[PDB]
Design a binder for this molecule. Sequence first.
Ligand SMILES: CCC[C@@H]1NC[C@@H](O)[C@H](O)[C@H]1C(=O)O
Ligand SMILES: CCC[C@@H]1NC[C@@H](O)[C@H](O)[C@H]1C(=O)O
Lengths: 580, 580
Amino acid sequence: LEYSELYPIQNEYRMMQSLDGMWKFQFDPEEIGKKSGWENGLPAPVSMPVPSSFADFFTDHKERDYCGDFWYETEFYLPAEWRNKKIWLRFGSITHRGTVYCNGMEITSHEGGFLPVLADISTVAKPGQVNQVVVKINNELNETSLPCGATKILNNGRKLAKPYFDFFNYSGLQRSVWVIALPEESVKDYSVDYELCGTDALVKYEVVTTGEHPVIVRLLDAEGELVAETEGKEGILQVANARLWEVRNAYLYQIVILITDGNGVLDEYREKIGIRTVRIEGTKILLNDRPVYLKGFGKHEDFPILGRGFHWGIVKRDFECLKWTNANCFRTSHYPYAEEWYQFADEEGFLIIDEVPAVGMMFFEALTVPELLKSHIADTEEMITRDKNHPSVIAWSLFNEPETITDYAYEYFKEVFAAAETYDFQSRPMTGAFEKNSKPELCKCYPLCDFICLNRYYGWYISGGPEIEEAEELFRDEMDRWKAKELNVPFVFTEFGTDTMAGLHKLPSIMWSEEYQKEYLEMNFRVFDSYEFVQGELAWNFADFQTTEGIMRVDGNHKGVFTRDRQPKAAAVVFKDRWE
Amino acid sequence: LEYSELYPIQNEYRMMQSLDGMWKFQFDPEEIGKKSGWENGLPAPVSMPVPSSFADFFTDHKERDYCGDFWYETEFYLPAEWRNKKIWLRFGSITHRGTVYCNGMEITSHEGGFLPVLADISTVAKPGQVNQVVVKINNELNETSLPCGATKILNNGRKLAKPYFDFFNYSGLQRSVWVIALPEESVKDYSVDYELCGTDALVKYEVVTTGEHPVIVRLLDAEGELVAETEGKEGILQVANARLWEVRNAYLYQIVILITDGNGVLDEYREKIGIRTVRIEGTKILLNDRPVYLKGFGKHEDFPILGRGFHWGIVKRDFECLKWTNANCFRTSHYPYAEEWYQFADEEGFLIIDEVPAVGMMFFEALTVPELLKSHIADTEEMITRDKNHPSVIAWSLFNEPETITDYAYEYFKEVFAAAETYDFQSRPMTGAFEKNSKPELCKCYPLCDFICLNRYYGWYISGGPEIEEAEELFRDEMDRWKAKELNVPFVFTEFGTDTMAGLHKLPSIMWSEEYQKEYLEMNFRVFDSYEFVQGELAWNFADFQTTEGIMRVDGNHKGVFTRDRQPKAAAVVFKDRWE
Ligand SMILES: CCC[C@@H]1NC[C@@H](O)[C@H](O)[C@H]1C(=O)O
Ligand SMILES: CCC[C@@H]1NC[C@@H](O)[C@H](O)[C@H]1C(=O)O
């Protein structure tokens, strides 16, 4: 990468200033912004909160459903002291794609709406002056970038997003934005990997800097005491009597990376890390050499009014709810989340399956597929480079429900997995979520996976309601087929659930009632527990969330175990009791 | 005041750094923190979002309902450049009362949970180092501070808040927190007052600084061009062809206040202001010499999960909803809001009745009343000093539903109104909201008001439901009595409404149904419109909001016209159509 993914910090060598707040904002339906000097300032803006999704603020359909080019602007005062440093704009994300301008100058463009965008403004920044940032953003969907979809043209050239995925096309500046200053020679990247040696541990590391000066790496314990120190861009930190990062029982060391010259320090980067190993052994998932059974949910970045907008309050409530259910894991369905989610998971000892936005791929024979592959690999590189050093991240999900039964699909995913392996210093488990169409006798892609993730809806989409006993039989039939393959790999259910309207009660139960959600889960558990190789269950979904409007979605997706405002339906207790 | 209420800005002279994010947090039920040295760091903290109210994150009752002492902590790097500046911690608020520590040292204490707390850390700050802030907060209610209530002690020592008011006792660090650096001689306060002279305007001003050097005041138009300049701490800016700030049609000038010495500028403060006049003439409220009829709502700072936590997203959605109803006004029931609300009202041309938290006073013969009065006047000073220069703020509300029929109450409020007048350079209208118990024949306090605000619930608390025809006659009976008093002042209804459960439909309507809310409002409008001296209507409430639990509150107060997640009930269209 031509930039650092490292989370910004502030110390003697590194500075940061938050650009969060009310920005200026303007829709650009005629695509005339770059033609009309908008990169020097928007002509008729309104105020827009950052971070947030823009959609749900407005009271008119055409604003909520806006698809196309739209613009953000703000101004910030840059302290004189920042002069001649490497000055960067850092966006938590820009959804889905955009071009960053600063002081009227095009700086960078980025494709992919769920990972950091870094824009080097060193040569155009004005220290000791007011500076301007303008962002051209586009939220259209296509088949050459993730997540995939189409764009429909209505009356008067009005664009409408048509997702190939089941979540609302929220967009904008949905995460925090910073302007930062780095030293001219800086720590750009680092990677850690762990080995357990009895009561001791080894922290293997690599550091990438933008210069040739000497590197020192220190490890501090949770009280800030030095426990290990080594010299060099590559080395091993030996940790006596290591306190391991454990499931729902985190312990975090602090790694400190220093660049020195002679007597003085040029740069210092610090980050909390956790000493832990994750391995697949036969059909078991091992955390620190002990089997762990995954218990939790697929989630979304989704909340009333804010859309996918980041807010620590959402993190806090969601983790308190997760803990109350006795969960230990969640999947970042269906895109990398704000970095802050992983920081918190690290502190709370939660396990994360980190997922790239490869959703809506079902297809692999189109002439656009080479471009799609490039995008998919790029997103994978960015995700892994960003998230690899979180102890919470124990697996990568490289797709959700693609077509997998053709040789077209196999050669495609072979390239993605190959690329992912080169990016992850830890080589931790890689997987993807399979839809039912990926039949055991047909699927060609499951051998690429370290463990297999299944999304199954026996009792909802297949033989629901009065046919639920047939659903169970069909479920066991498929699992018997997987069992007979004797693949000797763990299986994790990454989706199963029923749309459930809070307050809809019926005796006997019906599809959409709270009682049916309970009965469906009970049936699914009976099936899960019948197969030794099942090693995890992540329910779909943690909470009701927004989707595209349609005849199958009653104000979004109601397969939540919690309501959208984060309150438990009856089925939440079923999970709580089972996972205890 | 021993500090500045001015909103923080960043420029060559003034620096700011956000402390928002995840803080450390610890409950202190045994009241042991200070004797245990917690000001040096919390021993077993959890993470808590700032800004937010802490209550609704947790999944246990005793955490949600916690009443007593609790502590916050965070750390921040101070740039070395900030040395030789005056360095301050600035809390948007600390709810309800607290003591600020920095680097282990007690800095300041504050009583009053809805206005800024400033802590001068100049002498203890360590520029170029990590610094620590710890805050001890208490959220108990009593009768010597606002808002009033009691604190119940359960037999096991556990405390429970018992409000005398109808909103949940949210508390914590509910607004943004900054650390800021000011020049050693700085602009501390300023006041503007307007006079309209044909097509021109006069901006009279006073500036208070922390030194004796010359002051220059400039006024810039909305495009940044100079329209007026004067020298001196007191003066008049002459504005040719002034573009007045108008209801729902804002125009904002920028005032620029400079301190200078012989070698140049020492400090620069800039703020947007709007040229407008507010006057009461007979039964009319005049804005820029033209009558205005107030149309809008009482609001709350209240949102799912965040509690009263500030978020620009809530501001944006709420103002879009307000504009959609064709409103022009809201009251900050029942406490000053975060400053950002007023900034936005200034931009959107909304009128604000700014209200001090004098709620729950019904009582004035108790030995504790002199201390309550001092608290009330202190909050009034802070509110008016903070908010006086907003063009949106057209009136001060100095109470909500106190006892007003005794001589004790009259002497009390006489002092509050006198104090408020001394603090407001503009001498704008002052008022308070009266309950029904303040009968026209018995109330002694309405003559203190420049206009009268009535809270009335004819058709809800009085003769609701099958008796609504009687309610209308009773309402007209009271209004006929007010009419016969011929007070020649405007009346504004500041509360009227019905609890309404979204989705409860009945024909014929019943109390709590959406249809009844519509019929109740239609009845109230017929009465309002029967009296010339009625000059405004602010419905209770904009949105459903959280209250203490009880047999009368079904998950909070449902008199909202919008739901808590900001969607319109049937009655919302009734307002929209009337106010259009
Ligand atoms: C049978 C595929 C189910 C589908 N899987 C992907 C999720 O993103 C959707 O929300 C989920 C659903 O339809 O509920
Ligand atoms: C008869 C007084 C009514 C009362 N007034 C003050 C508000 O803070 C309450 O919410 C409102 C209510 O009970 O709805």
